[PDB]
Amino acid sequence: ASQPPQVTVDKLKRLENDFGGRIGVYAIDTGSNKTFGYRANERFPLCASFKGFLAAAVLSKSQQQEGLLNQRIRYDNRVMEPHSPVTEKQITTGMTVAELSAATLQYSDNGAANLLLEKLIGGPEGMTSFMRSIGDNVFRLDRWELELNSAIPGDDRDTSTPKAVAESMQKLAFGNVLGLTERHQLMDWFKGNTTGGARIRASVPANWVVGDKTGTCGVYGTANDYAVIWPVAHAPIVLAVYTSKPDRNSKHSDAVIADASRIVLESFNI
Numbered sequence: 001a002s003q004p005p006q007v008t009v010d011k012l013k014r015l016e017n018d019f020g021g022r023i024g025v026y027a028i029d030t031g032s033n034k035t036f037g038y039r040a041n042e043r044f045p046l047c048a049s050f051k052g053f054l055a056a057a058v059l060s061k062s063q064q065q066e067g068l069l070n071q072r073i074r075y076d077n078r079v080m081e082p083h084s085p086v087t088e089k090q091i092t093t094g095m096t097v098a099e100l101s102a103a104t105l106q107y108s109d110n111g112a113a114n115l116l117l118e119k120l121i122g123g124p125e126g127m128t129s130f131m132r133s134i135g136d137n138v139f140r141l142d143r144w145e146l147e148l149n150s151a152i153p154g155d156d157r158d159t160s161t162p163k164a165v166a167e168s169m170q171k172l173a174f175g176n177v178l179g180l181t182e183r184h185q186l187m188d189w190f191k192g193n194t195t196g197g198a199r200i201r202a203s204v205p206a207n208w209v210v211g212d213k214t215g216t217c218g219v220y221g222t223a224n225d226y227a228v229i230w231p232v233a234h235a236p237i238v239l240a241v242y243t244s245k246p247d248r249n250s251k252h253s254d255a256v257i258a259d260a261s262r263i264v265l266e267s268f269n270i
């Protein structure tokens, strides 16, 4: 009952040619275990999309350290990175670990990302080792915000693949690597993301529920989104959509990500 894979490939290749870049995807029907990929094992820059996994790493650490989420972090006289919309307002109050995690995921807050990487997760190396610990042998985070966003073609630093991103999202959302409380909290955070309205969310009927995390490097036409999608009375779908363009000075396209997502989701004939 699903569409032939080549039909879906054919559609994505036409979309790619109109876009003038590369589109990589991977999707998993968590109920049938049917999958679809296109450029699924090619590396793409993560950009901010790692922050959803950073929030998961924090939750995994809290599952072993009672009360970690409520711990208050203060950062008086810290130089805050560009795009710190939540953390720049909370210097006087500080923020809890839960609030930092929610901010980094839902607002892409860089101050929050680097605070959590410095104080809780152990830097890019620690982020990568969390992903290794869940069986993701592909992901790599090498640099801190914002240097990780350079998106240079051929540079494998700060990259993953659509398949690895989708597989890791599936494990975290639905597998055994996080406890029930932690899963539920992670899903709530993804559902409340604020930066994805023009991407995967724009590809689905408005009564479907979506949790997602975006990435927008700001160079080389490079942008992405990954998500859990809950269609009406169907098993959730996990989807990753990554894009890049060869020229440094091109812009990314939200619409191309939404259109790619629609093509892939339609292929499951839900």
Ligand SMILES: C[C@@H](O)[C@H]1C(=O)N2C(C(=O)O)=C(S[C@@H]3CN[C@H](C(=O)N(C)C)C3)[C@H](C)[C@H]12
Residues within 6 Å of the ligand: 047, 048, 049, 082, 083, 107, 108, 110, 146, 149, 194, 195, 196, 197, 214, 215, 216, 217, 218
């Ligand atoms: C500087 C890097 O950290 C960038 C990165 O990646 N982030 C994202 C994103 O997560 O999409 C964005 S998209 C930006 C966030 N706020 C805007 C937004 O939410 N909307 C809905 C337009 C656009 C930044 C450019 C940031």
Ligand code: NA
Residues within 6 Å of the ligand: 007
């Ligand atoms: Na058709």
Ligand code: NA
Residues within 6 Å of the ligand: 044, 045, 046, 148, 150, 151, 152, 155, 156, 157, 158, 159
């Ligand atoms: Na990269």
Ligand code: NA
Residues within 6 Å of the ligand: 059, 062, 063, 069, 181, 182
């Ligand atoms: Na917890």
Ligand code: NA
Residues within 6 Å of the ligand: 086, 098, 099, 100, 101, 102, 103
């Ligand atoms: Na928050």
Ligand code: NA
Residues within 6 Å of the ligand: 146, 147, 148, 149, 150
């Ligand atoms: Na940069």
Ligand code: NA
Residues within 6 Å of the ligand: 152, 153, 154, 244
């Ligand atoms: Na490239």
Ligand code: NA
Residues within 6 Å of the ligand: 253, 254, 255, 256
């Ligand atoms: Na476009």
